[PDB]
Amino acid sequence: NKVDYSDDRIIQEGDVDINKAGVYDITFRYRGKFKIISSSFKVTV
């Protein structure tokens, strides 16, 4: 079912420096009942 991005099970890794021009590696982790899944994306300022 559809869930919102602000849930308690979603854990993010690192910080996006909006004050600094550069690409950053940010990975979100959702702790499911059976496994934690990981997906990385790059954020360019």
Partner: protein, 49 residues
């Protein structure tokens, strides 16, 4: 010197086990059941011999 070396062996192998087990679970190379299985396993096995 056996007890001094195996105390560092029990402690470093437990530290190495429980930093690859939390790495494999957070990455997702292991299930939630298997992560709870090997967390009770490290509490009972990686102990003073």
């Amino acid at each position: 010197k056996i007890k001094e070396e195996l105390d560092q062996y029990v402690i470093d192998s437990k530290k190495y086990f429980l930093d690859s087990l939390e790495e494999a679970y957070n990455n997702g190379s292991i299930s939630a059941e298997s992560y709870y299985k090997y967390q009770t396993e490290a509490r009972e096995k990686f102990v003073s011999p």
